[PDB]
Design a protein around this ligand. Structure first.
Ligand code: CUO
Lengths: 69, 70
């Protein structure tokens, strides 16, 4: 589809820069939560928090899904 | 390929470097230093010689050479 973008970059990082940076990101330990998205009804947003056994809980983060009937 | 970009486009990190660099440049005691560099364009006038009685400002202004000098 003859169309192009003026620039292909993400937040000032060169494509080469991006690849190099990503490897570095791996360098440190990271923990993730995995969500299996089953499919929602109407669009909804989800918020999740991690709670300690003690009962403290911190807002983990959020993501949303677009949908309709 | 050092790249010159619009000042607005610049990243915080990019900005970070410039701010620090210039600040350090300001400090630079060397002839390469900022204060010394500034003298190139105008006063103190360096043109005839760094030490000459009459000194003129380094402006190849009003001349074809002008863009090259700048
Ligand atoms: O300064 Cu001599 O030119 Cu803009």
């Amino acid at each position: 589809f003859g169309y192009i973008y003026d620039t292909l970059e993400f937040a000032g990082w060169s494509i080469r820069g991006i690849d190099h940076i990503v490897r570095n990101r791996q360098e440190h330990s990271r923990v993730f939560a995995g969500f299996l998205l089953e499919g929602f009804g109407t669009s909804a947003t989800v918020d999740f928090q991690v709670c300690r056994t003690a009962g403290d809980c911190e807002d983990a983060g959020y993501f949303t899904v677009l949908g309709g009937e | 390929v050092m790249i010159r970009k619009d000042i607005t486009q610049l990243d915080k990190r990019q900005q970070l470097s410039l701010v620090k660099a210039l600040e350090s440049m300001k400090a630079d005691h060397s002839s390469d230093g900022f204060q010394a560099i500034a003298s190139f364009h105008a006063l103190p006038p360096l043109c005839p010689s760094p030490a000459a009685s009459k000194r003129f400002a380094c402006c190849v202004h009003g001349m074809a050479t002008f863009p090259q000098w700048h």
